[PDB]
Every structure is written in structure tokens, then in C-alpha cells.
């Protein structure tokens, strides 16, 4: 992980989530459950769908072509064919083989990036109203029910609403 998401602080991935690529795990008073963020997942797929498209679509330059047609009193020219034909085969194989290797590293890192940005989007909404575990989770200081948590996902979470509930829960532990 370049961004320290996937290999890093989120050791392993939720297997029970099968809605999207990136998402959340709520465990409040009503119950537990996974819930995937479809909006960020969609942008990733829009992106990846476009990479793969672009690697095929740009090579549209291809035309007519042929094989071999010289007698054994013109082996010199047949050797010139071989040099060229082997030559291109070398270039295309190399360029292809590497293109894969290069675009595969960045594709994996694009996912790391999206996950670290999602974790950061949650982190910035609830500054001192929750506790950064370091396993990439957030322990709430106040009670937040199923209707409260849609606000975190939606991104409409009010800091001032639950400010005093947490702030005065903080000194209770600090003894």
C-alpha cells in the first residue's frame, strides 16, 4: 500500500461486504451490519472502466497485413523480412508486458488512495466527537443510532448537535 490503507492500518478486508469496493461497519445498540459506500465505488469503477478502455481503444491503428513469399535465390530479402518481423514482435511484447506491470501497480494504489480518502472524509467530520482507534475504526463518545449514522455516510453530520455529550464524557474517563 502506497497510501498505507490496505496493507497498512486496515490489516485485511471485510469479506461480508459484497455491495461495493469500499465501505462501513456499524455496531450500535440496534445491531451490527455492513453497508457499502456506492458513490465512491462508482467513481473508482468509472475510472478503471476507462483505463482498460483507453489501453485498447488507442491502438485502433491497425490495417492490412500478410505472410511470406520469396524464393531461395532471394534469401537476403527474406532475412530482411525476418529482422523487421522479429523486431516488432520484440517491441510489442516488451511494451505490452511492461504496460501491464506499470498500470497494475498504479491501479492497486488508486484503491489504497480511495480508501484512505474515505477514512479521511469521516475523520474530518467528527473531530473530537469520536476516538481514532488505529485499526481504522471510530469509537463514539456519544450514543449514535441507525438514523444518526446515515448522516456520517451521507456526509451531513452535525458537530454542534452532539458536542457537549462527548466533551463532558471525556473528563469522566480522565481521572
Amino acid at each position: 500500500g502506497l497510501f498505507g490503507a490496505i496493507a497498512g492500518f486496515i490489516e485485511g478486508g471485510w469479506q461480508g461486504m459484497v455491495d461495493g469496493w469500499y465501505g462501513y461497519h456499524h455496531s450500535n445498540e440496534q445491531g451490527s451490519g455492513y453497508a457499502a459506500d456506492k458513490e465512491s465505488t462508482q467513481k473508482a469503477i468509472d475510472g478503471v472502466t476507462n483505463k482498460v478502455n483507453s489501453i485498447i481503444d488507442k491502438m485502433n491503428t491497425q490495417f492490412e497485413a500478410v505472410g511470406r513469399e520469396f524464393n531461395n535465390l532471394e534469401r537476403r530479402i527474406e532475412n530482411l523480412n525476418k529482422k523487421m518481423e522479429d523486431g516488432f514482435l520484440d517491441v510489442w511484447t516488451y511494451n505490452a508486458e511492461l504496460l501491464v506491470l506499470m498500470e497494475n501497480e498504479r491501479t492497486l494504489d488508486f484503491h489504497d488512495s480511495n480508501v484512505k480518502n474515505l477514512y479521511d472524509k469521516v475523520r474530518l467530520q467528527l473531530r473530537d466527537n469520536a476516538k481514532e482507534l488505529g485499526n481504522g475504526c471510530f469509537e463514539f463518545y456519544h450514543k449514535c443510532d441507525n438514523e444518526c449514522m446515515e448522516s456520517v455516510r451521507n456526509g451531513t453530520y452535525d458537530y454542534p448537535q452532539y458536542s457537549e455529550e462527548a466533551r463532558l464524557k471525556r473528563e469522566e474517563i480522565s481521572s
Binding site: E64, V66, G67, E69
Partner: protein, 55 residues
């Protein structure tokens, strides 16, 4: 069987032109000849297979 050889030749005759022959002997003249309208080139693919009625 036969010891001696048989060298063939060819050219393409323009739409509005005449081919003229003249021979003392040792000659093999054409009976038939072919109409050609050429457009584009390809090649002679070397394969053992036969036609699969597809595209």
C-alpha cells in the same frame, strides 16, 4: 519422364492494346487467357485446413 524443360512467361495486356506473336518453332501458344480487375493486394497463406463456411 521427359528430359527437356518448359519455360513459361506472362504479361498483362492493357484494355486498348494488341499483343503480337511471331515464331519459327519450339513454341507453345495460349488457347485461353484471363480477365483481371485488380484492386488491393494480399498474399498466399500457407495452411493445410479447408473452408469453414464462416466470416
Amino acid at each position: 519422364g521427359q528430359s527437356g524443360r518448359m519455360e513459361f512467361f506472362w504479361t498483362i495486356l492493357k484494355p486498348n492494346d494488341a499483343i503480337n506473336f511471331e515464331s519459327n518453332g519450339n513454341f507453345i501458344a495460349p488457347e485461353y487467357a484471363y480477365k483481371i480487375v485488380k484492386k488491393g493486394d494480399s498474399t498466399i497463406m500457407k495452411s493445410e485446413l479447408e473452408y469453414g463456411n464462416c466470416n
